[PDB]
Design a protein around this ligand. Sequence first.
Ligand SMILES: CCc1ccc(S(N)(=O)=O)cc1
Ligand SMILES: CCc1ccc(S(N)(=O)=O)cc1
Lengths: 169, 169
Amino acid sequence: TKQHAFTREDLLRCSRGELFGPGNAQLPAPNMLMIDRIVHISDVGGKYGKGELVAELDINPDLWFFACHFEGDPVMPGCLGLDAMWQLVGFYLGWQGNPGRGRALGSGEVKFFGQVLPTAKKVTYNIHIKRTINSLVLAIADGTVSVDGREIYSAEGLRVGLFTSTDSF
Amino acid sequence: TKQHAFTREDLLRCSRGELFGPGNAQLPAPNMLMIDRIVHISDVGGKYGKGELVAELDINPDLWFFACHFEGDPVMPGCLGLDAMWQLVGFYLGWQGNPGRGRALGSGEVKFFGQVLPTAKKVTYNIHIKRTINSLVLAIADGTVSVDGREIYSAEGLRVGLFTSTDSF
Ligand SMILES: CCc1ccc(S(N)(=O)=O)cc1
Ligand SMILES: CCc1ccc(S(N)(=O)=O)cc1
């Protein structure tokens, strides 16, 4: 609950398990990491009064996914923008001090109504925590993805849980 | 509608635009390609009588996503299994002979209730086409992801569209 913004170096330390500690929530390392900075995190406010994250990803034409997705038709995979929203809900649970490894549990409705081209400058994730539940610790959230000011994706009911050292599916 | 099974080499040709032709549906190239083979495709049968795909991904411990997702806690990203299901609905539309580039438009409910560990042998995608619509050509489908016989993910209302040479969001 202490730090309210995170640099790329903080997120890389998070990917190594060195932000929240071993066995606690981790962000992916490159090349699955789809966040450069967390600009804002709070446990109050947001759309539901249960907290909020704002995060950013810098875009340049040399990002790996543009070359393979698709050849002659470069576009950021929608699945990776959706993934960033799950990863941020996991980061939220770890930031609150809960123990365990993050797992995405699913989502209600996802809509893609725009795309991230290699000319774009910045993707912004807005995450609104809707509820946190305690057999598992889990969070439910809504999220949007925007590119250069324009909303392009929405997700309702993102669900992420934490799995202690004994938890399996 | 001609070939009913596809090898990895066919899917790589598809990723180059050389299966359905330039400007038509493409699978991603490595490292976003999450399918090794299409074992079965039909435009009849399936759960809704509007067609079916069965596809497979071989798992081994050296797949790139295990090293970065997560360090000390390797698990196939759920977003990439979900992505394979969108990519197969796109492949279906191209296989029917429709023109245009594929874009995922979203999904109804997604559930993850299992995980793909680096000890697993094979992921299987089962896609049931629910409806195809003609301003855009689009398909709606349900899908499951299974690992070594065990169902682990479900998606209802996967939605994929085709964008001609003039189409934007
Ligand atoms: C070719 C169909 C298609 C197109 C784009 C995606 S995306 N952008 O990975 O979610 C998935 C599937
Ligand atoms: C750490 C939270 C988390 C855990 C796993 C995923 S997944 N497997 O990329 O969909 C996403 C987010």
